[PDB]
Amino acid sequence: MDVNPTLLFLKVPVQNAISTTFPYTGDPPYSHGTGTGYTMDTVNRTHKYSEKGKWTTNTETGAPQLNPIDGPLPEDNEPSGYAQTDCVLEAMAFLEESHPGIFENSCLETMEIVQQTRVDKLTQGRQTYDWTLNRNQPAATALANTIEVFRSNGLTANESGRLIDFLKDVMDSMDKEEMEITTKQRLNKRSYLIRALTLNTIATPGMQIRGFVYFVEALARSICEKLEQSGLPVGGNEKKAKLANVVRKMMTNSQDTELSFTITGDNTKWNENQNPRMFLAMITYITRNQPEWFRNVLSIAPIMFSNKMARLGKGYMFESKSMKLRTQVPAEMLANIDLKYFNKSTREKIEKIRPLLIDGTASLSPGMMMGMFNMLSTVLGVSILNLGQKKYTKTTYWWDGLQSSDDFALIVNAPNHEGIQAGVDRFYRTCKLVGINMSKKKSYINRTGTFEFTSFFYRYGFVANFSMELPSFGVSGINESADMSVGVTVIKNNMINNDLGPATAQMALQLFIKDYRYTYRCHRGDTQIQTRRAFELKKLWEQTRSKAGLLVSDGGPNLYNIRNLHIPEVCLKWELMDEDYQGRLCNPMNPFVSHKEEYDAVATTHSWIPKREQMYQKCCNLFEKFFPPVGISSMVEAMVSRARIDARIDFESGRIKKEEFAEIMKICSTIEELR
Amino acid sequence: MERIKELRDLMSQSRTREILTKTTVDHMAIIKKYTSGRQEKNPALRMKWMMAMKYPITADKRIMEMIPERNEQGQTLWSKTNDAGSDRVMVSPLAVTWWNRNGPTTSTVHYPKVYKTYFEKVERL
Amino acid sequence: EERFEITGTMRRLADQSLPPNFSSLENFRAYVDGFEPNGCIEGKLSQMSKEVNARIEPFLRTTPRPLRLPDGPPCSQRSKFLLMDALKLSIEDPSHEGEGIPLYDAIKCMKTFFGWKEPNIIKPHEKGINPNYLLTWKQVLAELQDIENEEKIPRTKNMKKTSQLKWALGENMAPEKVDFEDCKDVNDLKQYDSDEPEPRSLACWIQSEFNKACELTDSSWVELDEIGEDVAPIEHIASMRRNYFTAEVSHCRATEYIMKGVYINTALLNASCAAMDDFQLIPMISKCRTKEGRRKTNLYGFIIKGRSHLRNDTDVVNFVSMEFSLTDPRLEPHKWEKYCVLEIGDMLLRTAVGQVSRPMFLYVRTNGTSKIKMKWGMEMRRCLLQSLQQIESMIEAESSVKEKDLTKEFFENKSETWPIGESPKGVEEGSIGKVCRTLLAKSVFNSLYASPQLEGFSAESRKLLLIVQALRDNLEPGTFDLEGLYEAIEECLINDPWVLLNASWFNSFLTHAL
Ligand SMILES: [Mg+2]
Secondary structure (H helix, E strand, C coil): CEECHHHHHHCCCCCCCHHHHCCCCCCCCCCCCCCHHHHHHHHHHHHHCCCCCEEEECCCCCCEEEECCCCCCCCCCCCCCCCCHHHHHHHHHHHHHHCCCHHHHHHHHHHHHHHHCEHHHHHCCCCEEECCCCEEECHHHHHHHHHHHHHHCCCCHHHHCEHHHHHHHHHHHHHCCEEEECCCEEEEHHHHHHHHCEEECCCEEEHHHHHHHHHHHHHHHHHHHCCCCECCCCCCHHHHHHHHHHHHHHHHCCCCCCEEEEEEEEECCHHHHCCHHHHHHHHHHHCCCCCHHHHHHHHHHHHHHHCCEEECCCEEEEEECCCCEEEEEECCCCCCCCCCCCCHHHHHHHHHHHHHECCCEEECCCCCCCCCCHHHHHHHHHHHHHHHCHHHHCCCCEEEEEEECCEEEEEEEECCHHHHHHHHHHHHHHHHCCCCCECCCCCEEEECCEEEECCEEEECCEECCCCCCCCCCCCCCCCHHHHHHHHHHHHHHHHHCCCCCHHHHHHHHHHHHHHHHHHCCCCCCCCCCCCCCHHHHHHHHHHCCCHHHCCHHHCCCCCCCCCHHHCCHHHHCCCCCCHHHHHHHCCCCCCCCCCCCCCCCCCCCCCCEECCCHHHHHHHHHHHCCCCCCCCCECHHHHHHHHHHHHHHHHHCCCCCHHHHHHHHHHHHHCCCCC | CHHHHHHHHHCCCCCCHHHHCCCECCCCHHHHHCCCCCCCCCHHHHHHHHHHCCCCEEECCCHHHHCCCECCCCCECEECCCCCCCCCEEECHHHHHHHHHHCCCCCCCCHHHHCHHHHHHHHCC | CCCCCCCCHHHHHHHHCCCCCCCCHHHHHHHHHCCCCCCHHHHHHHHCCCCCCCCCEECCCCCCCCCCCCCCCECCCCCCCCCCCECCEEEECCCCCCCCCHHHHHHHHHCCCCCEEEEEEEECCCCCCHHHHHHHHHHHHHHHHHHHHCCCCCCCCEECCCHHHHHHCCCCCCCEECCCCCCCCCCCEEECCCCCCCCCECCCHHHHHHHHHCCECCEECCCCCCCCCCCCHHHHHHHHHHHHHHHHHCCEHHHHHHHHHHHHHHHHHHHHHHCCCCEEEEEEEEEEEECCCCEEEEEEEEEEECCCCCCCCCCEEEEEEEEEECCCCCCCHHHHCCCEEEEEEEEEECCCCCCEEEEEEEEEEEEEEEHHHHHHHHCCCHHHHHHHHHHHHHHHHHHHHHCCCCHHHHHHCCCCCEEEEECCCCEEEECHHHHHHHHHHHHHHHHHCCCHHHHHHHHHHHHHHHHHHHHHCCCCCEECCHHHHHHHHHCCCCCCHHHHHHHHHHHHHHHHCC
């Protein structure tokens, strides 16, 4: 008998055991696909979908820039960047009609935000391009570097605190012809501007551009918040509802005759198509009848993205067979380089992009880099779902559904089959007019009752229950006291938010405790396992009357289960503790705590702090010149002692003269007089 | 000739001077160990890495007056080692357990009322 | 009154970042400000080509064809350590419980075997210096006896940097970086040719390897820590699910592979950061309680580590992997492409047929790994969670329809049998226990043979499955570019034996599913 797990689906429906079709559950050990060759394919394909549009030369950048929008309608089904301003605004107009006040009100709440928001906020985030040192770096370090330049150049408004003032400096920085940083390093206005508008490897953006992207997504949030169809930014179980709602809406009205089909949606090349200029058109229509200052700050992000440049990482690696060499050609001089070094597939990719290549960066006016305007792009998506109401269709077919960035789910109703087919086409084509290209490959359609949306698999009213990304249920590496609280908190939170099943949480708890005890050598007192702590913990175990009192870090039993996980361990076991044990555990005269004034922990002896240069390496390398020594002796008097021994052994065997022996003994007494 | 002339150069810089006269040959391996776990950058390992060491935990120097140097089995509980900022010393997790079985007992009647915010989660269950 | 302004360099960008026709942000602003809708969409819909459509090819029981698996020479074993072929020298270590010293655990195991032959090569590595693989094994045996020469016995062993080891670990095979200003013109200098990975055909062994993964052993391979007494009703149901599963998975081979994963990758990472520039010997150890229940240590073989000055998570550690086996490499040589197998001694095996003398082999191969791939192997216990959650999620789901928890029925109805296999007669069902181990093996192999090819095939095939499910639900399923979906699935089927079996498993299902 040959085992084939997939044969389960002969008995179990696929939605029930969909859990078995996710191979990893966790980030795998490769995530390959971010080469220099991969960046140039994004740059090419971004232009290839948008290639009939108007080419302009940028005055400030001096960069070839494609503008596909208000361009020629597609006559094929290939992805089109050719959006239509009149269509977008109309979609956004009919949204504000269908949700009266949505924009005005959402602007009022965002005008509250933009002022109150602090520069502090900008330090939170992933890798960022640091234009100060022309490298990728941590977010907080990239800002410290950027304010250090803005401090050196007359741009001290950032040091007021609020973010809007840091932007005011970023604005004034563009107008300045010189840009100087004491690292003195000098950038002309053109070279500065390239780096201010750079995306570096898909690719992270500069610190200048990031500021504005927040306030836009902030506005895009307040909108999404007010829309039922938007699947962002709502929580775990809160979202499963939205799936139930949209079916229940389209299936209770539906009489005997009226058909209903759900299409499991996924949009193709989402980022490479829809153009920054279109987002500017959206923002300006939302912020009509609003103050100029608010209109402006929000307008800045799309503008920068329409003028942006994509750096091609580092470059390509070469290799000589016979000679046994290898060399790394950078991106900067990949334009001014010979093509006969490269292969057949790589040449064409460089020959296509070279027209766009300006100062070692490729101009990219159309499209975007992944997950940047997630929320705003969702508004646009919803505005097309919005146009499926009986009124806007003006036909016997109508539609509704759910959208979150590129993923969507669409329910089309009509009195007959041809009606459904029509309603689908009308959605598919209305989508093309705003740069949204449904993926024919990825997508499918079936009678309403089953579908997928954001990997929630709906089947006749039930969505399958499994966590799709489990976190490291191991130790957190703070100390005994904290890690327990964190680890137990991490599981509870993964049950309520991430839809983690109980039996799995119990085993998750077991594997944590196992790791916890191994890490901190704090195996239960009654067990026989040997560590350094085994003795101390057993002496405490024997001493202690009520052992259920003892914390896991004191060789106590694990009392946690589903119900407890919210309680801190110290509280949980508080009644069961011996008077003297508790007396010591919490005595804040103890030498381990320091202070005693998102995890909840009582301060005990377990709340301890573990241990935390070119001057350390210099001393260690010189020690190797002496020993290619006694344990208690210091470095200098085990170096000065080895010198006099080699001095008097090389004097006997006759290696150094009387002159070179007297010189060593003289210097060996100058080192001893500094000690 | 060149290596002993170089040692006189490093003892003229008063920062490199105070790493040569303080540090011992035994306590070079202990300085190098925990920097091999900072390359790991994953804190879960960095902890497992440190718990392997004899004395990973830091404490006030008053511990040396409070708990003994060795326990009944003759295990060393702390060491007179150099810590970064001040006159804190290095301590084995044995010492924490030792304290929790032989330490001084203060009266913990105020702890249900100091941590009331925490303790109230138990009352509902 | 807050006032933020666009001027200078920004205004010229603002004016250039508009639709065509508009030469001025203020001009455009005014267009939008005073915009009112005028059936612009309804209009441009009629203007657009009718060739731009989403016509629905209906998915019938006739439309889907079996996936096409590639042709080529048979696929090779690419796992770090041996799986079903692996062999272990075991000691019973009762009195000493808890974390010991691996070096000595190995030597103690080694000393239980008194059958070592003069080692000779049986099936060489076509693309390698085979005499070096033999010298390395002799060096291990040699340097292990040299510890019993040392005045004070060492914690770990560092192999002497011989020619054969320097070779195997790739020492001085990285060429020197030469500034392109200096080697400007070189007449054999081409880029790192990322060649089309030559396609391989699905061999039998991968299925054999997996069949053996689903089997039980005479050894508990996991011992999980305690848990709070059950109180709430959910806690009683939870513990029931867990324990029933934990019971049938306890002794499953897959779980041995999980432990082999953890111990080896753990020991390799600790060495990679401890003895950075030493060629450390790293014994391949696991532990289990016997069927009677005594703590038993196992030695599978050795790994010699290269230089490991690791800065990044991607940075590589070259290692050699000498692993004991009873399996003759001449039976399925296509498997052992990457391996040079020696014949290093004779075992006696007290089987059903009295006792039989068999030869002992040593599957030696060159190999590498990174902090990320080691961590991956160290976190392989998650396979247990992944496996339990699949079982737990099904129960949760099958219970929803009835409204009552089916935890008891599933596990206790010993008549209730799940389809999980095929045989010459046809589709065979098994126990819920067989399903647990089968689902565990899947999670483990998904880890062991983790590839981007798998990621892809998993994601794209999922769609085809869900479509087929809709066809079985009689929900009039329809596709938009079904030929496009197949091309995307088949694009993933190149040479990976695991992804190829999963595709064979699909075709196998798709025939019965209709
Ligand atoms: Mg989808």
